[PDB]
């Protein structure tokens with residue numbers, strides 16, 4: 001069978017905190033007044049929720065209301081427990097209230113409002129300095145939630161709100177987040193395709209916080225190399241082939257052999273043989289201003305098949321790539 005794995009950091013957090021901390025099923029939800037919030041406009045719909053711009057009439061403040069679809073309503077206690085546990089943490093979205101939506105009859109989470117700068121404007125105009133700045137702000141959020149025994153499991157640009165005018169960042173959508181328990185086998189059907197770690201793609205369930213570090217590396221590669229997403233798989237299988245065309249097949253086989261993982265035989269006719277590519281291939285006159293030896297070294301230390309070998313969030317914070325960032 002597969003070789004067990006455990007995180008190299010924060011393994012003991014959930015065993016040394018009381019059962020009340022991680023046992024989200026036992027937690028009792030206190031409901032607020034749904035008529036305190038007037039819905040203004042729908043911002044989006046996903047498979048687990050609908051998100052609205054709203055106004056809190058008890059203070060006159062803009063808020064975001066997320067109304068959970070009945071499918072996600074089953075695992076609301078987990079999201080609420082994670083949001084309450086992390087509330088006040090650096091760059092974590094603040095849960096302001098929880099109400100019962102009168103239409104869906106499902107829980108509706110009320111969050112602080114972030115005046116989000118359009119994704120395209122950010123993706124097209126952030127400087128080398130700003131990219132480093134915002135990556136460092138994401139690292140604060142990830143080190144915080146990992147230090148609190150939580151993995152996000154859905155790190156991606158869509159889940160990072162940036163108010164560029166106020167240089168304010170928030171990591172949102174904690175709906176796929178989970179408490180990390182060493183030895184626990186987790187669902188690999190997490191994160192979005194382009195950001196899924198090789199551990200998920202090869203069906204290795206004993207993963208940990210380091211999955212978030214791979215997703216972060218995917219975001220960095222996309223930004224500095226101007227390819228969004230960086231690893232653009234047609235499906236979960238082709239997603240691993242796309243990675244292997246850059247990082248090579250040899251380190252992939254060393255990875256699966258280390259953990260005694262048996263690859264799905266469907267990979268035999270699609271994976272091929274690929275050498276690891278040097279990053280200069282992805283550097284052109286247009287994006288050279290975003291690329292530096294420090295950016296490449298930092299990326300090399302995130303985008304590793306072996307989840308145990310990746311930089312942790314705290315280690316990533318002292319990488320030379322952030323020396324130019326005002327602290």
Ligand SMILES: CCc1ccccc1-c1ccc(CNCCc2nc3cc(C)ccc3[nH]2)cc1Cl
Nearest residue numbers: 043051116119122123134157158160219220223
């Ligand atoms: C290429 C990704 C990346 C790499 C390195 C540094 C930063 C970023 C980044 C990170 C986040 C964003 C902005 N993302 C907006 C996502 C978003 N999701 C929302 C959801 C709601 C309900 C409202 C506004 C929302 N805005 C833009 C960018 Cl460019």
